[PDB]
Amino acid sequence: DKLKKVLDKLRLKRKDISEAAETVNKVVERLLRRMQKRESEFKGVEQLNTGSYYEHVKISAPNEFDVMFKLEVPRIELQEYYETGAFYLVKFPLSHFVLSATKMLSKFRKIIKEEVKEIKDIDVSVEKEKPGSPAVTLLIRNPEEISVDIILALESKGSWPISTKEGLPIQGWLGTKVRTNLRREPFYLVPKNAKDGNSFQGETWRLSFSHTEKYILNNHGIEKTCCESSGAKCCRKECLKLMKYLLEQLKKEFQELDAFCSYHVKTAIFHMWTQDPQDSQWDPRNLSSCFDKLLAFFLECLRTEKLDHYFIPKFNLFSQELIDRKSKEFLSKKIEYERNNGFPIFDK
Amino acid sequence: DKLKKVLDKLRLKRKDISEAAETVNKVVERLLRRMQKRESEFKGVEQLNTGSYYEHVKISAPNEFDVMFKLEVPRIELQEYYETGAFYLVKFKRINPLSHFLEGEVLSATKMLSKFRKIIKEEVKEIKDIDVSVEKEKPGSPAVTLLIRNPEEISVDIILALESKGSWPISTKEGLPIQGWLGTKVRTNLRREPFYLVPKNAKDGNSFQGETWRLSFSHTEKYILNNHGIEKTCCESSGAKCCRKECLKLMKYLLEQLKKEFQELDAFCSYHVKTAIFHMWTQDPQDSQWDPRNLSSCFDKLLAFFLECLRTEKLDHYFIPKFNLFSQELIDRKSKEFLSKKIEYERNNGFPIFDK
DNA sequence: ATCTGTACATGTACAGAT
DNA sequence: ATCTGTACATGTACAGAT
DNA sequence: ATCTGTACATGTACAGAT
DNA sequence: ATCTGTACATGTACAGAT
Ligand SMILES: Nc1ncnc2c1ncn2[C@H]1C[C@H](O)[C@@H](COP(=O)(O)OP(=O)(O)OP(=O)(O)O)O1
Numbered sequence: 124d125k126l127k128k129v130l131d132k133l134r135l136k137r138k139d140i141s142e143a144a145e146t147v148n149k150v151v152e153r154l155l156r157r158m159q160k161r162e163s164e165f166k167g168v169e170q171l172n173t174g175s176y177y178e179h180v181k182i183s184a185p186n187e188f189d190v191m192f193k194l195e196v197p198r199i200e201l202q203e204y205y206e207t208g209a210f211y212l213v214k215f216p217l218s219h220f221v222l223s224a225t226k227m228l229s230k231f232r233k234i235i236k237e238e239v240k241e242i243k244d245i246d247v248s249v250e251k252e253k254p255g256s257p258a259v260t261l262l263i264r265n266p267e268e269i270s271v272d273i274i275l276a277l278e279s280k281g282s283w284p285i286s287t288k289e290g291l292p293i294q295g296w297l298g299t300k301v302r303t304n305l306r307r308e309p310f311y312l313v314p315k316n317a318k319d320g321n322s323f324q325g326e327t328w329r330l331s332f333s334h335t336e337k338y339i340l341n342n343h344g345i346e347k348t349c350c351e352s353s354g355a356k357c358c359r360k361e362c363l364k365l366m367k368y369l370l371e372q373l374k375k376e377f378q379e380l381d382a383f384c385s386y387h388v389k390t391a392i393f394h395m396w397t398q399d400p401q402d403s404q405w406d407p408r409n410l411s412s413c414f415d416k417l418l419a420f421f422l423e424c425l426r427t428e429k430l431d432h433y434f435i436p437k438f439n440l441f442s443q444e445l446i447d448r449k450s451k452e453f454l455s456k457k458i459e460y461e462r463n464n465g466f467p468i469f470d471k
Numbered sequence: 472d473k474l475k476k477v478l479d480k481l482r483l484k485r486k487d488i489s490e491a492a493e494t495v496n497k498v499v500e501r502l503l504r505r506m507q508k509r510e511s512e513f514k515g516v517e518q519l520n521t522g523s524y525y526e527h528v529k530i531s532a533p534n535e536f537d538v539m540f541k542l543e544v545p546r547i548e549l550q551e552y553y554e555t556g557a558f559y560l561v562k563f564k565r566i567n568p569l570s571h572f573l574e575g576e577v578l579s580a581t582k583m584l585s586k587f588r589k590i591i592k593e594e595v596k597e598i599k600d601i602d603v604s605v606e607k608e609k610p611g612s613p614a615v616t617l618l619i620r621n622p623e624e625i626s627v628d629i630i631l632a633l634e635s636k637g638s639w640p641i642s643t644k645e646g647l648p649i650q651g652w653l654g655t656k657v658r659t660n661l662r663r664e665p666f667y668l669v670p671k672n673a674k675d676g677n678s679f680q681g682e683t684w685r686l687s688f689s690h691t692e693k694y695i696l697n698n699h700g701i702e703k704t705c706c707e708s709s710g711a712k713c714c715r716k717e718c719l720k721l722m723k724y725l726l727e728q729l730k731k732e733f734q735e736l737d738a739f740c741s742y743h744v745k746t747a748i749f750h751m752w753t754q755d756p757q758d759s760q761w762d763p764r765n766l767s768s769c770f771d772k773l774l775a776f777f778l779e780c781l782r783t784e785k786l787d788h789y790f791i792p793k794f795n796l797f798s799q800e801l802i803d804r805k806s807k808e809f810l811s812k813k814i815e816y817e818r819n820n821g822f823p824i825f826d827k
Numbered sequence: 828a829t830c831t832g833t834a835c836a837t838g839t840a841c842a843g844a845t
Numbered sequence: 846a847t848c849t850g851t852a853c854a855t856g857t858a859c860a861g862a863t
Numbered sequence: 864a865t866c867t868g869t870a871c872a873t874g875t876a877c878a879g880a881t
Numbered sequence: 882a883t884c885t886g887t888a889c890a891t892g893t894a895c896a897g898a899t
Pocket residue numbers: 173174175176180181182187189272331332367384385386389
């Protein structure tokens with residue numbers, strides 16, 4: 124009854140979805156046109172929508188949209204940066220860019236920013252660039268505030284990089300056929316736009332599997348009929364929404380939680396879904412246990428400082444390198460706290 | 472245990488699989504290549520392997536292969552033949568290498584199949600590598616059948632097909648009722664795939680005899696047989712084994728053995744058993760109603776279901792609901808009651824026909 | 828010199844074999 | 846329980862053509 | 864090569880029935 | 882309270898035409 128009532132609150136309204144979509148769609152379609160019918164280095168860029176709005180796990184409002192502009196590049200040689208798993212250098216139109224991530228992002232951003240100056244019917248500007256974000260972010264204003272991330276991506280049609288050989292461990296959940304077919308899809312690369320000063324900073328790209336993640340979110344049962352009109356509904360997505368909301372609310376309240384992001388929750392629940400594959404373990408009537416064993420799984424990840432990338436097993440999103448220890452026990456007490464008092468933060 | 476051992480007899484041997492595939496593939500590759508040559512009307516034809524050997528339900532010996540030579544035919548218009556659901560006239564809206572088979576707008580099936588057949592015959596003459604002849608044409612069959620004598624005997628049905636990429640013909644709207652078993656996304660995807668038309672090729676002196684085509688969904692049946700569980704891991708190396716294909720194999724064998732002894736059964740064919748089990752799989756969607764430890768019971772309910780279809784004279788095509796393969800129009804009641812008796816007799820007496 | 832239908836190259840599920 | 850031939854889907858190369 | 868048209872998935876919203 | 886059935890809305894895949 125409690126968690127159900129929070130999910131009613133988190134539910135997007137049909138009207139809000141329509142108003143945001145037609146304005147987001149107007150901007151994106153025009154932006155896509157410039158990079159094409161104009162003689163840019165990005166002629167051939169194709170649009171692939173990603174993230175929580177398109178996975179139907181957006182909460183609260185339709186105010187954040189993520190779009191990948193992906194560009195096929197033939198026979199690129201990858202070269203893994205210092206064994207990290209997820210970061211690579213790229214080698215062999217694009218001549219003006221070893222292919223520089225920053226050099227290519229800047230021209231892309233230049234093109235976007237120019238075309239936004241020519242938009243006269245929508246209140247839209249280009250947010251100032253952020254370190255560590257490969258996106259060019261639009262800030263739109265219907266009366267309400269909407270944010271669009273335009274992510275630049277390379278598309279390689281080759282065998283996936285060796286670092287993912289043990290990745291995507293869906294074999295007992297979605298199976299070997301699904302896994303083999305998914306690994307036949309392209310894979311993508313996006314700028315590592317960190318501004319730390321470390322060595323190969325400006326030429327490093329990151330592996331992206333947002334297209335695989337979207338398929339999983341929408342094909343998430345061991346039974347083919349899970350959540351379909353002739354199957355049984357499960358509560359896998361509601362748990363992800365609840366865990367996203369609890370992290371959102373904690374991040375509003377505490378600046379110490381700044382190094383956490385919803386992707387950490389997304390990754391943790393891919394692992395849960397793999398360890399509890401049966402749809403009956405995500406039955407709607409057990410929403411509380413499910414949310415709770417998700418909380419405990421997430422605290423075990425904090426306590427051991429271990430949360431491996433679902434596709435890149437050796438890449439630990441929870442290493443000392445990315446999140447100082449103390450940041451983690453801060454989140455652990457805060458989370459054990461909400462847990463052991465019936466989630467007060469959910470009433471605000 | 473009794474049925475486990477039948478399956479052991481029925482299992483194909485890798486050695487045989489090997490010697491038979493090496494030959495069969497040689498011939499088919501050579502026939503396909505000749506269809507791309509010169510000013511061939513069939514240039515562009517593409518190969519699709521179908522049937523029980525590629526579904527992995529071929530029993531006893533790998534001695535019968537089925538292959539589809541399908542030709543994409545755009546800008547195509549269908550006239551259902553007399554409300555039968557399965558049979559169609561094919562018309563074109565433009566005036567094409569197929570023109571030599573047109574009869575003002577209407578695409579002649581027997582003319583096309585005849586030209587196809589003459590080419591296979593001519594290319595088989597040039598094969599001096601293996602003992603292989605073209606079997607005398609069989610009425611009702613769209614196939615061109617090769618008999619290969621690699622010591623052992625081997626049949627290959629080369630089926631000629633039109634490939635259309637449009638949405639499926641409305642007589643299938645209510646077909647393929649897999650929503651509760653493989654689900655709606657699977658169904659939507661399957662129905663985006665092409666559909667196929669093969670020559671009906673009967674010689675019954677009925678109107679439009681030589682211009683009637685028949686819907687075929689062999690490619691969809693291939694997908695279903697190799698993706699047959701409600702659970703995605705069914706029969707996979709990290710999932711649980713089921714006995715769905717093992718029931719099919721036992722049913723096919725019972726029919727095969729009886730058909731081998733009793734001429735009364737000429738009207739029957741493995742497609743009848745294959746259809747019945749598609750319905751049984753829809754009736755019982757859960758993989759747990761096909762546990763391997765339940766083989767004798769699973770096989771038994773499939774037999775009961777088949778007897779009911781026989782007795783009530785109703786076995787609806789899985790894809791075309793209004794097309795009844797057990798109508799009086801296609802099989803005498805005496806044919807059906809005869810098979811009913813033999814099935815009931817096998818069932819209530821230890822399946823003595825398995826030991827033959 | 829560049830283009831492209833044909834076919835080799837690669838990876839793996841399925842299932843027989845040891 | 847692992848090793849292994851066939852089938853099949855998709856990436857890529859290049860002799861022969863433009 | 865680009866774009867429209869079609870089909871049905873995923874949602875939200877709400878009355879009527881359990 | 883929840884389940885079921887209809888209406889309403891967007892997202893996405895791809896056939897066919899221009
Ligand atoms: N593949 C990734 N690797 C690292 N960080 C990521 C990745 N994907 C997303 N993030 C981070 C970026 C942002 O800080 C945060 C949310 O970004 P976003 O792309 O909008 O995700 P999302 O759409 O799945 O969830 P949300 O509901 O928060 O919008 O997650």
